[PDB]
Amino acid sequence: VNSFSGYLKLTDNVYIKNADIVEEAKKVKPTVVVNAANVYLKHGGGVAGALNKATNNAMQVESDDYIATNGPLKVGGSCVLSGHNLAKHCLHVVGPNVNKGEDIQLLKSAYENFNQHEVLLAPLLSAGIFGADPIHSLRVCVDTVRTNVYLAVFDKNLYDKLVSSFL
Numbered sequence: 212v213n214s215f216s217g218y219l220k221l222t223d224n225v226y227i228k229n230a231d232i233v234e235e236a237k238k239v240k241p242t243v244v245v246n247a248a249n250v251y252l253k254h255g256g257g258v259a260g261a262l263n264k265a266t267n268n269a270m271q272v273e274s275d276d277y278i279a280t281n282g283p284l285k286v287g288g289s290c291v292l293s294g295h296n297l298a299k300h301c302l303h304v305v306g307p308n309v310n311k312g313e314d315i316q317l318l319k320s321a322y323e324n325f326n327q328h329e330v331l332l333a334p335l336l337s338a339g340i341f342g343a344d345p346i347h348s349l350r351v352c353v354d355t356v357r358t359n360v361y362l363a364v365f366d367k368n369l370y371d372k373l374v375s376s377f378l
Protein backbone atom coordinates (compact mmCIF):
# COMPACT_ATOMS: atom_id res chain seq x y z
CA VAL A 212 0.00 0.00 0.00
CA ASN A 213 1.21 3.49 -0.93
CA SER A 214 -0.19 7.02 -0.68
CA PHE A 215 -0.93 7.60 -4.38
CA SER A 216 -4.62 8.51 -4.78
CA GLY A 217 -7.12 8.84 -7.62
CA TYR A 218 -5.19 6.85 -10.24
CA LEU A 219 -6.73 4.66 -12.91
CA LYS A 220 -5.05 1.24 -13.06
CA LEU A 221 -3.90 0.37 -16.58
CA THR A 222 -1.95 -2.84 -15.87
CA ASP A 223 -0.50 -4.82 -12.99
CA ASN A 224 2.13 -2.11 -12.45
CA VAL A 225 1.14 1.07 -14.37
CA TYR A 226 -1.28 3.70 -13.05
CA ILE A 227 -2.35 7.03 -14.60
CA LYS A 228 -3.94 10.29 -13.44
CA ASN A 229 -4.77 13.74 -14.81
CA ALA A 230 -2.52 15.76 -12.53
CA ASP A 231 0.18 18.41 -12.33
CA ILE A 232 3.30 16.40 -11.47
CA VAL A 233 4.57 19.34 -9.39
CA GLU A 234 1.44 19.35 -7.22
CA GLU A 235 1.39 15.54 -7.06
CA ALA A 236 5.00 15.46 -5.86
CA LYS A 237 4.36 18.15 -3.24
CA LYS A 238 1.41 16.14 -1.89
CA VAL A 239 2.85 12.62 -1.97
CA LYS A 240 6.56 13.33 -1.42
CA PRO A 241 7.40 10.12 -3.31
CA THR A 242 10.69 8.32 -2.97
CA VAL A 243 11.36 9.05 -6.65
CA VAL A 244 10.00 11.72 -8.98
CA VAL A 245 11.09 11.43 -12.61
CA ASN A 246 12.18 14.53 -14.50
CA ALA A 247 11.87 14.85 -18.28
CA ALA A 248 15.50 15.92 -18.57
CA ASN A 249 17.80 16.81 -21.44
CA VAL A 250 21.45 15.73 -21.63
CA TYR A 251 22.67 19.08 -20.26
CA LEU A 252 20.22 19.07 -17.33
CA LYS A 253 19.09 22.54 -18.45
CA HIS A 254 15.64 22.66 -16.88
CA GLY A 255 14.15 25.43 -18.96
CA GLY A 256 10.63 24.38 -19.84
CA GLY A 257 8.13 21.58 -19.93
CA VAL A 258 8.07 19.27 -16.93
CA ALA A 259 11.71 20.08 -16.13
CA GLY A 260 11.16 23.82 -16.06
CA ALA A 261 8.14 23.35 -13.79
CA LEU A 262 9.90 20.97 -11.38
CA ASN A 263 12.93 23.22 -11.19
CA LYS A 264 10.79 26.32 -10.54
CA ALA A 265 9.11 24.48 -7.67
CA THR A 266 12.57 23.92 -6.10
CA ASN A 267 13.35 27.66 -6.28
CA ASN A 268 16.14 26.81 -8.81
CA ALA A 269 17.94 24.47 -6.37
CA MET A 270 17.51 21.63 -8.87
CA GLN A 271 19.32 23.69 -11.52
CA VAL A 272 22.17 24.63 -9.15
CA GLU A 273 22.69 20.97 -8.22
CA SER A 274 22.43 19.93 -11.87
CA ASP A 275 25.05 22.45 -13.02
CA ASP A 276 27.52 21.01 -10.52
CA TYR A 277 26.67 17.48 -11.71
CA ILE A 278 27.38 18.40 -15.35
CA ALA A 279 30.57 20.28 -14.48
CA THR A 280 31.87 17.10 -12.82
CA ASN A 281 30.47 14.37 -15.06
CA GLY A 282 29.63 15.88 -18.44
CA PRO A 283 26.33 15.42 -20.27
CA LEU A 284 24.05 12.43 -19.98
CA LYS A 285 23.32 10.12 -22.90
CA VAL A 286 19.99 10.24 -24.71
CA GLY A 287 18.22 7.27 -23.14
CA GLY A 288 20.24 7.65 -19.94
CA SER A 289 19.60 8.97 -16.46
CA CYS A 290 21.09 10.12 -13.20
CA VAL A 291 19.80 10.19 -9.62
CA LEU A 292 19.96 13.56 -7.87
CA SER A 293 18.16 15.13 -4.93
CA GLY A 294 14.40 15.49 -4.99
CA HIS A 295 14.72 18.73 -2.99
CA ASN A 296 11.33 19.73 -1.53
CA LEU A 297 9.41 17.50 -3.96
CA ALA A 298 10.63 13.92 -3.34
CA LYS A 299 13.49 12.05 -1.72
CA HIS A 300 15.21 11.63 -5.10
CA CYS A 301 14.78 12.92 -8.62
CA LEU A 302 15.55 10.48 -11.43
CA HIS A 303 16.51 12.70 -14.37
CA VAL A 304 15.71 10.65 -17.49
CA VAL A 305 16.53 11.76 -21.04
CA GLY A 306 14.00 10.60 -23.58
CA PRO A 307 14.66 11.36 -27.24
CA ASN A 308 13.56 14.83 -28.36
CA VAL A 309 11.86 14.48 -31.75
CA ASN A 310 12.23 18.23 -32.27
CA LYS A 311 16.01 17.56 -32.27
CA GLY A 312 15.81 14.57 -34.64
CA GLU A 313 16.65 11.96 -32.00
CA ASP A 314 15.89 8.27 -32.51
CA ILE A 315 12.50 7.32 -31.06
CA GLN A 316 13.80 3.77 -30.49
CA LEU A 317 15.78 5.30 -27.61
CA LEU A 318 12.47 5.77 -25.78
CA LYS A 319 12.55 2.15 -24.63
CA SER A 320 16.09 2.60 -23.28
CA ALA A 321 14.91 5.72 -21.43
CA TYR A 322 12.05 3.85 -19.75
CA GLU A 323 14.40 1.00 -18.73
CA ASN A 324 15.91 3.40 -16.18
CA PHE A 325 12.62 3.21 -14.25
CA ASN A 326 13.23 -0.49 -13.50
CA GLN A 327 16.01 0.46 -11.06
CA HIS A 328 13.37 1.91 -8.70
CA GLU A 329 10.54 0.00 -7.04
CA VAL A 330 8.02 2.89 -7.20
CA LEU A 331 8.09 6.16 -9.17
CA LEU A 332 5.97 9.21 -9.94
CA ALA A 333 6.65 10.11 -13.56
CA PRO A 334 5.56 11.98 -16.68
CA LEU A 335 5.27 10.32 -20.06
CA LEU A 336 8.78 10.39 -21.50
CA SER A 337 9.34 12.29 -24.75
CA ALA A 338 5.80 13.77 -24.59
CA GLY A 339 5.00 17.47 -24.55
CA ILE A 340 7.79 19.66 -25.90
CA PHE A 341 9.93 16.59 -26.66
CA GLY A 342 7.60 16.03 -29.61
CA ALA A 343 6.78 12.31 -29.47
CA ASP A 344 3.30 10.80 -29.70
CA PRO A 345 2.11 10.39 -26.07
CA ILE A 346 -0.02 7.37 -27.02
CA HIS A 347 3.20 5.73 -28.19
CA SER A 348 5.05 6.80 -25.05
CA LEU A 349 2.39 5.17 -22.86
CA ARG A 350 2.62 1.95 -24.89
CA VAL A 351 6.40 1.83 -24.50
CA CYS A 352 6.06 2.55 -20.78
CA VAL A 353 3.62 -0.32 -20.25
CA ASP A 354 5.74 -2.71 -22.33
CA THR A 355 9.07 -1.73 -20.69
CA VAL A 356 8.58 -0.70 -17.05
CA ARG A 357 8.09 -3.60 -14.64
CA THR A 358 8.26 -1.60 -11.40
CA ASN A 359 5.31 0.41 -10.07
CA VAL A 360 4.87 3.63 -12.02
CA TYR A 361 2.35 6.40 -11.30
CA LEU A 362 1.99 8.55 -14.41
CA ALA A 363 0.87 12.17 -14.10
CA VAL A 364 -0.62 13.69 -17.26
CA PHE A 365 -1.07 17.47 -17.05
CA ASP A 366 -3.48 17.93 -19.97
CA LYS A 367 -7.00 16.69 -19.20
CA ASN A 368 -7.88 16.37 -22.87
CA LEU A 369 -4.76 14.26 -23.41
CA TYR A 370 -5.45 12.17 -20.30
CA ASP A 371 -8.91 11.24 -21.61
CA LYS A 372 -7.51 10.29 -25.02
CA LEU A 373 -4.79 8.11 -23.45
CA VAL A 374 -7.33 6.19 -21.36
CA SER A 375 -9.94 5.79 -24.10
CA SER A 376 -7.38 4.55 -26.64
CA PHE A 377 -5.47 2.27 -24.26
CA LEU A 378 -5.30 -1.32 -25.44
Ligand SMILES: O[C@H]1CC[C@@](O)(CNc2ncnc3[nH]ccc23)CC1
Pocket residue numbers: 230231232233257258261334335338339345363364365366369
Ligand atom coordinates in the same frame (compact mmCIF):
# COMPACT_ATOMS: atom_id res chain seq x y z
O1 LIG B 1 1.22 16.91 -24.29
C1 LIG B 1 1.20 16.44 -22.97
C2 LIG B 1 2.11 15.20 -22.84
C3 LIG B 1 2.39 14.73 -21.37
C4 LIG B 1 2.59 15.87 -20.29
O2 LIG B 1 2.16 15.27 -19.11
C5 LIG B 1 4.11 16.39 -20.09
N1 LIG B 1 4.35 17.51 -19.12
C6 LIG B 1 3.97 17.57 -17.77
N2 LIG B 1 3.50 16.43 -17.16
C7 LIG B 1 3.14 16.52 -15.83
N3 LIG B 1 3.17 17.59 -15.02
C8 LIG B 1 3.64 18.70 -15.64
N4 LIG B 1 3.78 19.94 -15.02
C9 LIG B 1 4.28 20.83 -15.97
C10 LIG B 1 4.46 20.16 -17.17
C11 LIG B 1 4.06 18.79 -17.01
C12 LIG B 1 1.69 17.08 -20.65
C13 LIG B 1 1.76 17.53 -22.08
Ligand SMILES: [Cl-]
Pocket residue numbers: 257258338339340341
Ligand atom coordinates in the same frame (compact mmCIF):
# COMPACT_ATOMS: atom_id res chain seq x y z
CL1 LIG C 1 5.74 19.25 -21.65
